[PDB]
Amino acid sequence: LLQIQPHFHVEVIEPKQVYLLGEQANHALTGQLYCQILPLLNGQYTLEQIVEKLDGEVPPEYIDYVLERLAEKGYLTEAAPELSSEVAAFWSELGIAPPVAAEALRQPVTLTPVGNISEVTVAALTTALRDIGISVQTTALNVVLTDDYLQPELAKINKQALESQQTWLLVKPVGSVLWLGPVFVPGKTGCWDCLAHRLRGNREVEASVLRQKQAQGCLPTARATLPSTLQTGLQFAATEIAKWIVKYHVNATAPGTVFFPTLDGKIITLNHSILDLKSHILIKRSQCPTCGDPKILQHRGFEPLKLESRPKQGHRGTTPEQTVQKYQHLISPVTGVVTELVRITDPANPLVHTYRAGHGSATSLRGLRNTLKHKSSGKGKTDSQSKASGLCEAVERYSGIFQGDEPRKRATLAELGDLAIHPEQCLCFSDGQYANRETLNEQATVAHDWIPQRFDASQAIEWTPVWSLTEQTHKYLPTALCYYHYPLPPEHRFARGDSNGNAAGNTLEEAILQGFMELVERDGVALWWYNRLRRPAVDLGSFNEPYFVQLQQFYRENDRDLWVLDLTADLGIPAFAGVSNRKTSERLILGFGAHLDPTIAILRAVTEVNQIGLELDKVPDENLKSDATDWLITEKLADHPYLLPDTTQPLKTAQDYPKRWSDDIYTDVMTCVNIAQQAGLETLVIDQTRPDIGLNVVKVTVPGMRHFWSRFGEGRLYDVPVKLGWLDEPLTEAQMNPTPMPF
C-alpha cells in the first residue's frame, strides 16, 4: 500500500499546485498530474488499484514516472499496517519509513530500579512503553530508574555494563527536577563515573554533610513529587527510549543517515517548580579511573615540556569570542565545571564590563559558608573579553584542584638532593612568623595570611615534577604547593596551594606568559605596599588609548577619583596599580596589572578596579558582607600616603616603557625567562591541564618572588628596593606595613 508521507496534510489547489503541509516543514508540488494522483496517495490504495480511479484519465506510464520521481525525491513511502496514522506520522517527521519503525520497535528492553524507586513506578513505565509498541523483557538497552544520580549501586551497574558491553539509560522521574539521560554507550560515551566525578564537585553542601557525618554513600532529596510530574517524566522517558531504539536499528542497516538527536552523552533537566529545560553535555574523561586510563597525568608530569612557536593577533592567539564558544560546554551545574556565567554589566554603561562565574571541601558550617562564597570574576575592556576572563578564571581554579591522579612521588628532600626545592623558598615566611604562628593567625583579619607549620625535612612527602625553563630540566616542589586542597597530616601542614602564578590560555605558552605576568604583578605590589613606598602617577593621556580618559570621566560623574601608580621594579616589566576613592565612607579600591605591553598593564589594572569597586559601591555601607569590607568602611586615604602619587616625582608616560614583546608568544616567554635569569631567578612550570577540560592551565613558580600577602621572610622584599635606590637602606620586619593588602 502506497502513501505520501503521513506527517503531511495534503492540500490540492486545482490548477497546478499541491501543497504538503507539515508541522515543522512545508513543501510544494507543481504539475497538473500531481493534483490527480495525490488525492489517492493516502495509504488506502495499492499502485494497481489506482488505475480504475483514473484509467483513461491518465496512462500508467505517466504514473510510474511520477511515483519514481516522488520516491527518489523523498515524498513517497509504503504504509505500515501495524502503526496508527498518528504514530507513523511521528517517525516520518524524523525521516523514518513506517515499515522500518515497526520492525525497530519489536526490540525488547530491560528495566532496573535502584534506590527507593517503587515497584509500581516501574510498572508505569512498562505501561507507558507498552502503549507505544515497546515490550519489556524479564537486550539492546537497559533503562535504570533512580532517585539520585549518585546512588552507589550505579557504580556496580556501570562496571558490569562496561564489561558486558551493555548500552543503558539513566532517569530520575521523582522530585521537582526530572533528570533524563544520558544513554551510556561503553567505549563511545563517558561512563557513569565520568558523570559522577562532576556531580561530586557540584554538590558541595551534600558532600560536606557527608564528611561531617562520617567523621563521627549519598543523600536523597527527591521527595517533592506530584502524580503528574512522575507521569510527565516516565512518559517523557518512554518517548526518548523509543527514539534511541529506532536510531540503533537503522545504524545497523546503514550507519549515519539518521540525524535526529538522542540522549547519548547528553542529560536533560526539566525543572517542574520554575519550569525550564536544559541540555547538558557529558564529556568522556580520558583519565577516568573506570572507563579511561587514569595514568595520563602521571606520565605527562615527567615528560619534557614541549613548547613551540605560536603566532599572535590583545596578545592572544585567538579571539575571546571563539574561546567562549568552544568551552561553553563546561558551563553547567550538572555535567559542568562552571555553574553559571552572568553579566552584572548595566547595559546603560558601555565602559564597565564585569562577569560573575560559578563555583571546595569543608568540615564545618563555618568552613562551608566560606566555600560557595568563592566565585571568579570576569574583567575586561570589552564585554566579550570580560566574558572570556570570567569563564577561564573559573576553569583555571578547577583544573588546579588536587584530584589524586597528579604527577608525584614520595621521598625526602635528601634523596632528591639538588633537584628538589625547599618550600620555604616559595613561601618566604620569617622565623619570627613561624615562631608566633598560633597567635598571629588568631589575630588575623583574612585567611590569605595563614602562616603554615614549619617544614620537617625528615618526612617523606609527595613531590611533583616541575619543568625548569631556565635549566631545561625537571625540578621538584612539594605537591602541597602545586595543587589546591592537597590533604596533609594535621601534625605537618606546611603549605596550602595558592592562586599565584596560576593561569589559563588557548595554548600552553599563552598560559605560562600570563602565569609569569601574574608573578611579576604580585612581586611588584609587595615591594610597594609592605615597604610603603611613594610612587609616581601615570599620565593616561600620553598613551594612545582613549579608554583611560573616558573611564576617569565616568568615575567623576559617579562620586569618585581614579589614578594609576607605577610598580615596575628590578625586572623592568611594566607593572601598575589603579587606585580610586569616593569623594563623598571613602571606599578605596585597588587593581593590579602586569604585562610587557604597558597599555595592556594599565588596562588590566583599571578593569580590575571596576570589577571590585562599582558593584560594591551601589550598595549601602552598613549592609556589606565582603571579605575586604572593614578596609572600605573605615580606612582613609589620609592614613595611607603610599596610595596617592608622589607629587615630587614627574608623571610617567608611554615613552618611559620600552618594548620587549614580539609577534610570537613563545619568544615573549623566552624573553621573560631570561629577564628572570639575570635577576638570578629560576622559572618553573607545572602543566595542570585536564584532558576532559581541554583549556590549557599551568602554574608558573619563580621561587624568591614575593606574594602581596604578609610574608616577611628575608629576600627580595628588603633587598630590591635598595638595589634600585628607592630606599637608602633596607627596612626591618618590624617596620613593614602592618595592614595587610586587602585585595
Binding site: 513543501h27 504539475g31 505517466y62 520521481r69
Partner: peptide, 12 residues
C-alpha cells in the same frame, strides 16, 4: 512530454 516535464518540487 509536457505533462511530465513541468513536475517541479521544492521546499518552503
Amino acid at each position: 512530454s509536457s505533462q511530465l516535464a513541468e513536475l517541479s518540487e521544492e521546499a518552503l
